[PDB]
Each structure stands twice: as structure tokens, then as C-alpha cells.
Amino acid sequence: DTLVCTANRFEQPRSTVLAPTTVVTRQDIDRWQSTSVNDVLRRLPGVDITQNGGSGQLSSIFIRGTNASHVLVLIDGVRLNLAGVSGSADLSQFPIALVQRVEYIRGPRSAVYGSDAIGGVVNIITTRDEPGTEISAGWGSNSYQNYDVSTQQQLGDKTRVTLLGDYAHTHGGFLSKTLYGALEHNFTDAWSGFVRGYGYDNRTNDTRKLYSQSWDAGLRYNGELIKSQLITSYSHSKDYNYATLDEMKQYTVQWANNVIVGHGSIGAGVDWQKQTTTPGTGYVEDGYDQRNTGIYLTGLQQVGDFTFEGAARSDDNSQFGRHGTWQTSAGWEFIEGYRFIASYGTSYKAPNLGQLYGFYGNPNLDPEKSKQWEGAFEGLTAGVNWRISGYRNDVSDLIDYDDHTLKYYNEGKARIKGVEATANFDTGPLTHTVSYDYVDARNAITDTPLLRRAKQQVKYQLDWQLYDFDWGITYQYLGTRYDKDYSSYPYQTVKMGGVSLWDLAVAYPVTSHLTVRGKIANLFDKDYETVYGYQTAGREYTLSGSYTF
Ligand SMILES: CCCCCCCCOCCOCCOCCOCCO
Ligand SMILES: CCCCCCCCOCCOCCOCCOCCO
Ligand SMILES: CCCCCCCCOCCOCCOCCOCCO
Ligand SMILES: CCCCCCCCOCCOCCOCCOCCO
Ligand SMILES: CCCCCCCCOCCOCCOCCOCCO
Ligand SMILES: CCCCCCCCOCCOCCOCCOCCO
Ligand SMILES: CCCCCCCCOCCOCCOCCOCCO
Ligand SMILES: *SCC1=CC(C)(C)N(O)C1(C)C
Ligand SMILES: [Mg+2]
Ligand SMILES: [Mg+2]
Ligand SMILES: [Mg+2]
Ligand SMILES: [Mg+2]
Known part of the structure; x- marks a missing residue:
């Protein structure tokens, strides 16, 4: 319903963000009955998730064709830590129970957040x-x-x-x-x-x-x-x-x-x-x-x-x-x-x-x-x-x-x-x-x-x-x-x-x-x-x- 904070770090109406923008709420996740973050993300535009098997196995996120390491995954606006040793975000381990909102903005955004934000940004709130x-x-x-x-x-x-x-x-x-x-x-x-x-x-x-x-x-x-x-x-x-x-x-x-x-x-x-x-x-x-x-x-x-x-x-x-x-x-x-x-x-x-x-x-x-x-x-x-x-x-x-x-x-x-x-x-x-x-x-x-x-x-x-x-x-x-x-x-x-x-x-x-x-x-x-x-x-x-x- 209308607001995002992920585009410039502060609240604004979505109609006001020119980049394509998806928002997923807790209500969606409960309805979809997702038991992992991948299952939430795989539903959205420009997301291509690959996975070495079922839930918990190593996975890669390809946003709009870019490399695994070319998406910025934030947790509450801060670069996901699991991502830091390999330089490529893998959310197979991150607990779905903590996801109350997802704001996903496509297109680049290094001009706000710096490194990784190439295919787009996924902010897990x-x-x-x-x-x-x-x-x-x-x-x-x-x-x-x-x-x-x-x-x-x-x-x-x-x-x-x-x-x-x-x-x-x-x-x-x-x-x-x-x-x-x-x-x-x-x-x-x-x-x-x-x-x-x-x-x-x-x-x-x-x-x-x-x-x-x-x-x-x-x-x-x-x-x-x-x-x-x-x-x-x-x-x-x-x-x-x-x-x-x-x-x-x-x-x-x-x-x-x-x-x-x-x-x-x-x-x-x-x-x-x-x-x-x-x-x-x-x-x-x-x-x-x-x-x-x-x-x-x-x-x-x-x-x-x-x-x-x-x-x-x-x-x-x-x-x-x-x-x-x-x-x-x-x-x-x-x-x-x-x-x-x-x-x-x-x-x-x-x-x-x-x-x-x-x-x-x-x-x-x-x-x-x-x-x-x-x-x-x-x-x-x-x-x-x-x-x-x-x-x-x-x-x-x-x-x-x-x-x-x-x-x-x-x-x-x-x-x-x-x-x-x-x-x-x-x-x-x-x-x-x-x-x-x-x-x-x-x-x-x-x-x-x-x-x-x-x-x-x-x-x-x-x-x-x-x-x-x-x-x-x-x-x-x-x-x-x-x-x-x-x-x-x-x-x-x-x-x-x-x-x-x-x-x-x-x-x-x-x-x-x-x-x-x-x-x-x-x-x-x-x-x-x-x-x-x-x-x-x-x-x-x-x-x-x-x-x-
Ligand atoms: C790729 C962008 C192309 C967009 C095409 C839209 C062109 C014009 O849109 C329709 C103009 O409005 C007419 C809408 O239908 C008639 C309703 O008229 C008002 C109701 O009294
Ligand atoms: C979609 C092209 C014509 C103008 C936009 C119509 C509205 C599109 O919304 C529906 C999207 O649904 C999928 C349609 O896929 C066919 C269009 O793919 C473009 C291929 O170059
Ligand atoms: C203005 C909206 C974009 C329209 C997309 C669908 C129409 C396809 O028209 C011709 C496609 O030409 C072949 C290239 O297709 C892939 C290019 O994608 C855009 C990057 O230049
Ligand atoms: C108040 C903060 C504004 C600072 C951000 C501006 C940085 C934008 O950089 C755009 C990249 O521009 C390419 C050229 O940068 C190379 C640096 O050149 C330094 C000596 O020429
Ligand atoms: C006082 C400037 C504050 C905004 C600077 C950030 C944008 C830097 O890139 C813009 C350069 O491209 C041309 C911009 O012209 C349109 C104005 O940009 C939108 C900000 O109102
Ligand atoms: C606040 C808005 C900032 C937007 C600036 C973008 C424009 C960048 O233009 C300059 C790009 O850098 C050119 C570097 O110089 C040419 C490279 O060749 C020199 C050999 O070392
Ligand atoms: C490739 C050319 C690069 C040129 C960079 C130019 C940077 C833009 O400068 C003009 C800024 O003017 C708009 C300021 O935006 C702030 C919004 O508040 C203004 C209220 O109307
Ligand atoms: S979208 C920015 C965001 C994340 C969170 C920490 C939940 N917030 O307080 C803001 C609005 C800084
Ligand atoms: Mg009662
Ligand atoms: Mg066991
Ligand atoms: Mg058991
Ligand atoms: Mg160097």
C-alpha cells in the first residue's frame, strides 16, 4: 500500500519512485505460506533464483540477468552479513520468520548504497x-x-x-x-x-x-x-x-x-x-x-x-x-x-x-x-x-x-x-x-x-x-x-x-x-x-x- 523507504532511505509514495518497485508485506507472506525467503523472492519481477536442491541449500539470486554478486541485499537497510565473506548474497539460510516486509527496487542504486546495487536492491525489513x-x-x-x-x-x-x-x-x-x-x-x-x-x-x-x-x-x-x-x-x-x-x-x-x-x-x-x-x-x-x-x-x-x-x-x-x-x-x-x-x-x-x-x-x-x-x-x-x-x-x-x-x-x-x-x-x-x-x-x-x-x-x-x-x-x-x-x-x-x-x-x-x-x-x-x-x-x-x- 503506497509507501517505500528503500529508494532514498526515507519514506516516500511509490508513484514518486521512477524505478520499478515491488512491495511484499507480511500479509502476502502469510497468504502465500512461504517457508523460505527464496519462495517469496522468486515470485517477483526480474528475479531468477537457482538452488542446489530444496530449502537450505546454497542458492544464487540473478536479478535482471546480472551476476549473483550484482544484487544488494539489505536487512533493515544494512548490507546482509552472510554476503560478506563470498561477496554474493544467499538468503537460503535467513529465517523467513523475521521477514515482515520486503521492498525491492530494480535498476542500479550504488549512487545511494555503494557496492553491489547493480541489478537492483532487495531490502528485508x-x-x-x-x-x-x-x-x-x-x-x-x-x-x-x-x-x-x-x-x-x-x-x-x-x-x-x-x-x-x-x-x-x-x-x-x-x-x-x-x-x-x-x-x-x-x-x-x-x-x-x-x-x-x-x-x-x-x-x-x-x-x-x-x-x-x-x-x-x-x-x-x-x-x-x-x-x-x-x-x-x-x-x-x-x-x-x-x-x-x-x-x-x-x-x-x-x-x-x-x-x-x-x-x-x-x-x-x-x-x-x-x-x-x-x-x-x-x-x-x-x-x-x-x-x-x-x-x-x-x-x-x-x-x-x-x-x-x-x-x-x-x-x-x-x-x-x-x-x-x-x-x-x-x-x-x-x-x-x-x-x-x-x-x-x-x-x-x-x-x-x-x-x-x-x-x-x-x-x-x-x-x-x-x-x-x-x-x-x-x-x-x-x-x-x-x-x-x-x-x-x-x-x-x-x-x-x-x-x-x-x-x-x-x-x-x-x-x-x-x-x-x-x-x-x-x-x-x-x-x-x-x-x-x-x-x-x-x-x-x-x-x-x-x-x-x-x-x-x-x-x-x-x-x-x-x-x-x-x-x-x-x-x-x-x-x-x-x-x-x-x-x-x-x-x-x-x-x-x-x-x-x-x-x-x-x-x-x-x-x-x-x-x-x-x-x-x-x-x-x-x-x-x-x-x-x-x-x-x-x-x-x-x-x-x-x-x-
Ligand atoms: C505506451 C503508452 C501508451 C499509452 C496509451 C494511452 C493513450 C491515451 O489513453 C487514453 C486517453 O483517455 C481515454 C480513456 O477512455 C475514455 C474515457 O474517457 C473519460 C470518461 O468520461
Ligand atoms: C506488453 C506490450 C504492449 C503494451 C503494454 C501492454 C501492457 C502490458 O502488461 C501486461 C504484461 O503482460 C505480459 C505481456 O507480455 C507480452 C509483452 O512482452 C513484450 C515483449 O517484447
Ligand atoms: C519502451 C518500452 C520497451 C519496449 C520493450 C518491448 C518492445 C520490443 O521492441 C523491439 C525490441 O528490439 C529487440 C531488442 O529487444 C531487447 C531489448 O531490450 C531493451 C534494451 O535495449
Ligand atoms: C554531497 C555528496 C556528493 C558527492 C557525489 C559525487 C560523485 C559522483 O561521481 C560520479 C562519478 O563521476 C565520475 C568522475 O569521478 C572521478 C573523480 O574525478 C576526480 C578528479 O577528476
Ligand atoms: C542540489 C542537487 C540535488 C540533487 C543531486 C542528485 C542528482 C545527481 O544527478 C543528476 C544529474 O543529472 C541531471 C539532473 O537534472 C534533473 C534534476 O535531478 C533530480 C533532482 O531534483
Ligand atoms: C552530482 C552529479 C554528478 C554527475 C557527474 C557525472 C558526469 C561524469 O563526467 C565525467 C566522467 O569522468 C571523465 C574522466 O575523464 C576521462 C577519462 O580519461 C582520462 C584518462 O585518465
Ligand atoms: C552529464 C551531465 C552531468 C551534470 C550534473 C548536473 C547536476 C544537477 O544540477 C542541477 C540541480 O538542480 C536541481 C536540484 O534538485 C534539488 C531539488 O530541489 C529543488 C526544488 O525545486
Ligand atoms: S527503507 C529504510 C528503513 C528501514 C528501517 C530501519 C525499518 N527504517 O527505520 C527505515 C525507514 C531507516
Ligand atoms: Mg475475541
Ligand atoms: Mg534434524
Ligand atoms: Mg526431527
Ligand atoms: Mg586500482
Whole structure:
């Protein structure tokens, strides 16, 4: 419903963000009965998730054809820690119980957040405003079991505590336990503070043990015209496979300001980040200490039928030095309800620890660089909200291994051309939400398709209510995809064919406190893989409930 904060770090109406923008709320996730973050994300425009099996296995996110490491995943506005040792976001381990909102903005945004924000940004928000206590649970195929307790209460005027415990367990598997607490205090009606803690202990079967904890603390000012935020953040994760141990601590501090001016806004902040890893983390001998500080400017202005939006950033990285990025967007509502939008942006990706200092390291690498153009038409027609975008993304200085000298070097190039189309509309009691993605992602030097990516995807959601039963059908076509066959050397490129997949979900309020839900995932039990060799789930049944007071 209308607001985002992820585009410039502060609240604005979505109609005011010129980049394509998806919002997923807790209500959606409960209806969809998602038992992981991937299942939430896989439903959205330009998202191509591949996974080495069912839930908990290593996964990669390809937003609009870009590399796994070319999406910025934020947790409550701060770069996901799990992402820091390898330089590529993998959310298979992150607990769905913590996801209260997802804001997903496509197109570049390094001009606000710095490194990784190339294909787009996915911000997972863990805060809810929803007082009262809840107990939920579920049971499903592969002996899935879930138990969950949460409460949000007032501790008098001005203060609130939120607490959550979640236990999720499956067999052949993947066990996950999660604890979250938060305190929110309002000093005046304009001034706020918060302290927020959470941690999860996961186990995945070769046997993996991931633990992570995050602590965030901040001050906010929310005036009639001025807005300010000061947030400090600390993450500690530890990742065992067995005796290999990857450990990282990530510290972040960021001060941002924004003022309403005219019909629009101007903003600015400063951003600092430190990452220390343990000796032997990322198959690198020594422990490292990496630092980054960035300063940026945002702006938004509406003049008559035109909207202009922009951001500009400079980052100083302890390893590669200085890199600047920028982006600008103009939109023209040429007739009421219809709008052309043109965007241009630059973005980048920092080298990772392995590329820099691993056995094959090159300590002098520069960032990977993206330039993107996009053009869109959006409209409201006869009750249909729609949008169609075409984009071009030239990526250069890709960090590639050279076999001859056994070192990483900047040299590869990629060209992505894509089309995004979306629509939502109702027909009597039925709500339809539909998207189509075309992605022609290639190596620009050799002109061959990049690997692991569906060239086409079609995604359709159908929701309705009949007798207090709330039903959701979800359909997805996963198009043809090229991959390597690793069972035989030299590794040949294989073609994986298109697949249709259907899910069926329902919910019923037994009483005003008690809702029961059931789901059949992959209803037609289709055999398929998103990584060659790795078998996905098959038809699965889940059954759950929630008791509120
Ligand atoms: C390739 C050319 C690069 C040129 C960069 C120019 C930067 C823009 O300068 C003009 C800024 O003017 C608009 C300011 O926006 C702030 C919004 O508030 C203004 C209220 O109407
Ligand atoms: C006082 C300037 C505040 C905004 C600067 C951030 C945007 C930097 O890139 C913009 C350069 O491209 C041309 C911009 O012209 C249109 C105005 O940009 C929208 C901000 O109102
Ligand atoms: C606040 C808005 C900032 C927008 C600025 C974007 C415009 C960038 O234009 C200059 C790009 O840099 C050119 C570098 O110089 C040419 C490279 O060749 C020199 C050899 O070292
Ligand atoms: C108030 C913060 C505004 C600072 C952000 C501006 C950075 C935008 O950089 C755009 C990239 O421009 C390319 C050229 O940058 C190279 C630096 O040149 C320095 C000496 O020429
Ligand atoms: C790719 C962008 C193309 C957008 C095409 C839209 C062109 C004009 O849109 C329709 C103009 O409005 C007519 C709407 O239908 C008649 C309703 O008239 C008002 C009701 O009294
Ligand atoms: C203005 C909205 C974009 C329209 C997209 C669909 C129309 C296709 O028209 C011709 C396509 O030309 C072939 C190239 O297709 C992929 C290009 O994607 C856009 C990047 O340049
Ligand atoms: C879609 C092209 C014509 C103008 C926009 C119509 C509204 C689109 O919304 C529905 C999107 O549904 C998927 C349609 O897929 C066909 C369009 O693909 C463009 C291929 O170049
Ligand atoms: S979208 C920015 C955002 C994330 C969260 C920390 C939940 N917030 O307080 C803001 C609005 C800074
Ligand atoms: Mg077990
Ligand atoms: Mg058991
Ligand atoms: Mg250099
Ligand atoms: Mg009652």
C-alpha cells in the first residue's frame, strides 16, 4: 500500500519512485505460506533464483540477468552479513520468520548504497507495527515442523517491546532457530530511538552450521519538513563446514538527512562500514580488515507533468580507493494516468577477499562497473495498472580468473538486454498479479549467453475469497537455461528446458482468533532442476495455523 523507504532511505509514495518497485508485506507472506525467503523472492519481477536442491541449500539470486554478486541485499537497510565473506548474497539460510516486509527496487542504486546495487536492491525489513500476541505452527511433507511465538506490547506510554521465537525443522535436512527482540522509544512525537537484537542458529545436512547475530541501534527525527536518521549496526556471523570456519564481523554507521522542498525533496548522508574476517575465512590465510566510507546526495522534484529523480555518490574503499557513481531519471505524465520514464545510472561491485588475497589473488583489482539505460511506459487503463520497461546493462571490468597466469584480473564484459512487463487488475472477486521478464544476458566479447539464467519467465498470481475461504493460485514458467555438466570433464554446456509450476494455497478463519492454512506446492509434481544435477522438491503439502490475542 503506497509507501517505500528503500529508494532514498526515507519514506516516500511509490508513484514518486521512477524505478520499478515491488512491495511484499507480511500479509502476502502469510497468504502465500512461504517457508523460505527464496519462495517469496522468486515470485517477483526480474528475479531468477537457482538452488542446489530444496530449502537450505546454497542458492544464487540473478536479478535482471546480472551476476549473483550484482544484487544488494539489505536487512533493515544494512548490507546482509552472510554476503560478506563470498561477496554474493544467499538468503537460503535467513529465517523467513523475521521477514515482515520486503521492498525491492530494480535498476542500479550504488549512487545511494555503494557496492553491489547493480541489478537492483532487495531490502528485508524485520519491523512490524502490529500489537498483540501470536502463536503459530505448521506441519508438512519431509516432516517439516514449525513453532513460533511473538508479541509486541506497550511498556507504558512512549515505549514498545517486540519479541519473537521461531523453531523450524525438516528431515531428509535443515534446522533453524531464531530469536528476535526490539525496543522502540518515542522521546517526543518527532524524536525516536530503537535498539534491536536478533540471532539464528542453523544446521544443514557434509554438515553445515551457521550462526549469526545482529544488533542495531538508532535515533530518528521525523519532523514536518526535516527527517534525520543515525543508525549503528553490528553483525557477527560464523559458518562451519565439516573443519573450515568462516567468520566475519561487520560494523556500520550511517547518518542521513532529508528535507521536503517544493514538491519534492533533497537528501544527503554519510556511510561507514568495517568488515573483519578471521584468519582462514574465505580460503584466505590472514584475517582482513576492510573499510569503506561513502558520501551521497539524493534529489526528487515534480514540476508540472514532469518528475525528476537522482542520486550521486562517492565511495573511498581501503583497498581500491575512490569510486564515484550516479543516476538520473525523468518521467513525463503526458496524459492523466499514463507516463513515460527514462533512466540512466552507473553502479559497481567491490572485489571480494578471495579475488584479492586468496590463493589466486590480485590485490590491485578495481571494481566491476555497470552502466544502465532504461525506458518505461506505465499506465492505468480500464482498471488495469500496468507497466512495461526495456533496459540495457553494459558491465565491464568483470573479475575473471586467467588460467595461464593463475590470477584474477579485471577484463570481462557483459551486455544484458531485457524487457519487464507487469500488470495487476481485478475481475469481479478475482485479483490478478502478472509479470513477464525477457533477459538476453551475454558475454559481450564472445557474444555467448551467460550461464545459469532463464531467458524468459512468466509469473501469475490469482487470489479470491468465496465462503470465508481465501484461495491463492500461483503459476510460474521458468524458461530455458544453460548450465555446465560437472559430472564429466571437460565440462560441457547443457540446455535445460522450460517448466511450468503450480502452487495452491488456502486459508480459513475458524474463529476471529484462529486461522488455519493449507498449501500444495508444485501441485503437478513436476521433476526439474534450476542447477544441473540438483533435484528440487516435488509435490509438497503444508498445514498450519495461527492463534492471535
Ligand atoms: C552529464 C551531465 C552531468 C551534470 C550534473 C548536473 C547536476 C544537477 O544540477 C542541477 C540541480 O538542480 C536541481 C536540484 O534538485 C534539488 C531539488 O530541489 C529543488 C526544488 O525545486
Ligand atoms: C542540489 C542537487 C540535488 C540533487 C543531486 C542528485 C542528482 C545527481 O544527478 C543528476 C544529474 O543529472 C541531471 C539532473 O537534472 C534533473 C534534476 O535531478 C533530480 C533532482 O531534483
Ligand atoms: C552530482 C552529479 C554528478 C554527475 C557527474 C557525472 C558526469 C561524469 O563526467 C565525467 C566522467 O569522468 C571523465 C574522466 O575523464 C576521462 C577519462 O580519461 C582520462 C584518462 O585518465
Ligand atoms: C554531497 C555528496 C556528493 C558527492 C557525489 C559525487 C560523485 C559522483 O561521481 C560520479 C562519478 O563521476 C565520475 C568522475 O569521478 C572521478 C573523480 O574525478 C576526480 C578528479 O577528476
Ligand atoms: C505506451 C503508452 C501508451 C499509452 C496509451 C494511452 C493513450 C491515451 O489513453 C487514453 C486517453 O483517455 C481515454 C480513456 O477512455 C475514455 C474515457 O474517457 C473519460 C470518461 O468520461
Ligand atoms: C519502451 C518500452 C520497451 C519496449 C520493450 C518491448 C518492445 C520490443 O521492441 C523491439 C525490441 O528490439 C529487440 C531488442 O529487444 C531487447 C531489448 O531490450 C531493451 C534494451 O535495449
Ligand atoms: C506488453 C506490450 C504492449 C503494451 C503494454 C501492454 C501492457 C502490458 O502488461 C501486461 C504484461 O503482460 C505480459 C505481456 O507480455 C507480452 C509483452 O512482452 C513484450 C515483449 O517484447
Ligand atoms: S527503507 C529504510 C528503513 C528501514 C528501517 C530501519 C525499518 N527504517 O527505520 C527505515 C525507514 C531507516
Ligand atoms: Mg534434524
Ligand atoms: Mg526431527
Ligand atoms: Mg586500482
Ligand atoms: Mg475475541
